[PDB]
Design a protein around this ligand. Structure first.
Ligand SMILES: Cc1cc2nc3c(=O)[nH]c(=O)nc-3n(C[C@H](O)[C@H](O)[C@H](O)COP(=O)(O)OP(=O)(O)OC[C@H]3O[C@@H](n4cnc5c(N)ncnc54)[C@H](O)[C@@H]3O)c2cc1C
Ligand SMILES: Cc1cc2nc3c(=O)[nH]c(=O)nc-3n(C[C@H](O)[C@H](O)[C@H](O)COP(=O)(O)OP(=O)(O)OC[C@H]3O[C@@H](n4cnc5c(N)ncnc54)[C@H](O)[C@@H]3O)c2cc1C
Ligand SMILES: Oc1ccc(/C=C/c2cc(O)cc(O)c2)cc1
Ligand SMILES: Oc1ccc(/C=C/c2cc(O)cc(O)c2)cc1
Ligand SMILES: [Zn+2]
Ligand SMILES: [Zn+2]
Lengths: 228, 229
């Protein structure tokens, strides 16, 4: 039995992202997996890290420290319920797939806010549980990313650089740091520019990949992997 | 006479970010610069890229494409007024400083959304008209970043990898894309770890640098600079 969380960040059901999201749901559902989707925009998911993320009265309301207050709210069970709902889905999941359009060589702010607010100290990492020992060790994470720019652009000497370069903050700084093993990213280059046939072929490739997802080994999430 | 915009992202005025923001204001105001701060959290700045960002008839209301719809909105002067307001600030600034704590090797979501929403096509870039031909050419940008991780952690052979690696999406993918010339980042490592006196040093060092900021030249915002040979 396997349990997947899809964290989906696109405003339009009929987008290329929406299609990627839906074939993941359909294939993983067809395999018999437990599937849950956090459709961030439909949820009006709050992106801002603020003192409203802590219910009750703050531990030190004089000088508001987000990292400390959230750490302490997580331990005292006083986080906002939007955050705790997300944490229960992550806790239960064996795999977390992130389905998003690349925005400024990173994730859309709404998704960034999910990272920022859900992955708090005590839940996702602690001292000493980070990187290989992060608190989510034993889970898999996969970034399924679409781009505006072409694969040629995204090379070591193309105008955008190697697509691995932009993956570092997300795969290493974020997912590795919380102890996920990182599956290889799914990158779907320039759908707006591809033909009907090319776009179908990209959806197809992803569907196929999912059939064997559970067989996969994680990448070595290293500076060498991203930059070497 | 120079005009600066500081885009500032921290919830707490008494924070180390707040002190950096305020020494910047102080010093730049002392020089006689014109200074504007966007205090994002204070402003309840909207981070989410949504259809609320266009006021008029969408080009294709059946299938919402944020990039397309905002570009056209920019050209029709139909963007949400919060976006327009930031754009005017940017347009008038000679220098844009981003003041923020590192969150997940990047900017805090609220600031990410300022990037996502403010830097739309037509305003910050066209196709063609990007990177060196981006539309914000002849402006300067500077990232002033604070971190939890120590400088050592942020080396090439340490757990976080080199500081420069995490700058890439911000310096190259965003700022250089839009035409900015990028000034060398100010990175204030691990204040929470530093002593009071070490913290003071870091604040004073930023103030000292600002004294001669208009004499600086930008970095070469290339793969090489960020990643080595
Ligand atoms: C703020 C912002 C910043 C950006 N920054 C970057 C950046 O740093 N780098 C970069 O490279 N790009 C950037 N982009 C562009 C962005 O990454 C792309 O626009 C996005 O990845 C495209 O995916 P989408 O799902 O919206 O495409 P869609 O526009 O939704 O897809 C293209 C076409 O595919 C069709 N389609 C949908 N489903 C299917 C299917 N099953 N079969 C066939 N066709 C299908 C759609 O109907 C549409 O015609 C940025 C965009 C924004 C808005
Ligand atoms: C969601 C999240 C994700 C994070 N991700 C990362 C990450 O990827 N990488 C990473 O390295 N870190 C990360 N961090 C850590 C974060 O970057 C640091 O906590 C932040 O940079 C510290 O800056 P601050 O202004 O909040 O410091 P503060 O906590 O406000 O400052 C530290 C101390 O300086 C004192 N001080 C304030 N003003 C002065 C002054 N003028 N003179 C002397 N002392 C002064 C304050 O009183 C305080 O005691 C993350 C934090 C969060 C919440
Ligand atoms: O609420 C909180 C959420 C996240 C953090 C993250 C810290 C962090 C520190 C590093 O040195 C490297 C890193 O990749 C991440 C701290 C508080
Ligand atoms: O509203 C917007 C619409 C599109 C974009 C695109 C950005 C982009 C940025 C890059 O560094 C490389 C690239 O190939 C594309 C930005 C804002
Ligand atoms: Zn890693
Ligand atoms: Zn560059």
């Amino acid at each position: 039995g396997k349990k997947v969380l899809i964290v989906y960040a696109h405003q339009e059901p009929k987008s290329f992202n929406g299609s990627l999201k839906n074939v993941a749901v359909d294939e993983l559902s067809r395999q018999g997996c437990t599937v849950t989707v956090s459709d961030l925009y439909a949820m009006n998911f709050e992106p801002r890290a603020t003192d409203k993320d802590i219910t009750g009265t703050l531990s030190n309301p004089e000088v508001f420290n987000y990292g400390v207050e959230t750490h302490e709210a997580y331990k005292q069970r006083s986080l906002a319920s939007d955050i705790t709902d997300e944490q229960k889905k992550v806790r239960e999941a064996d795999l977390v797939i992130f389905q998003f359009p690349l925005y400024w060589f990173s994730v859309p702010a709404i998704l960034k806010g999910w990272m920022d607010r859900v992955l708090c100290q005590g839940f996702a990492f602690d001292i000493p549980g980070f990187y290989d020992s992060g608190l989510l060790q034993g889970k898999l994470a996969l970034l399924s990313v679409t781009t505006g720019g072409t694969a040629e652009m995204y090379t070591k000497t193309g105008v955008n650089g190697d697509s691995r370069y932009f993956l570092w903050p997300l795969q290493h700084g974020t997912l590795h740091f919380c102890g996920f093993k990182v599956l290889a990213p799914q990158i779907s280059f320039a759908p707006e520019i591809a033909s009907e046939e090319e776009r179908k072929g990209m959806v197809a490739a992803w569907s196929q990949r999912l059939q064997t997802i559970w067989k996969e080994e994680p990448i070595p999430c290293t500076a060498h992997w991203h930059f070497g």
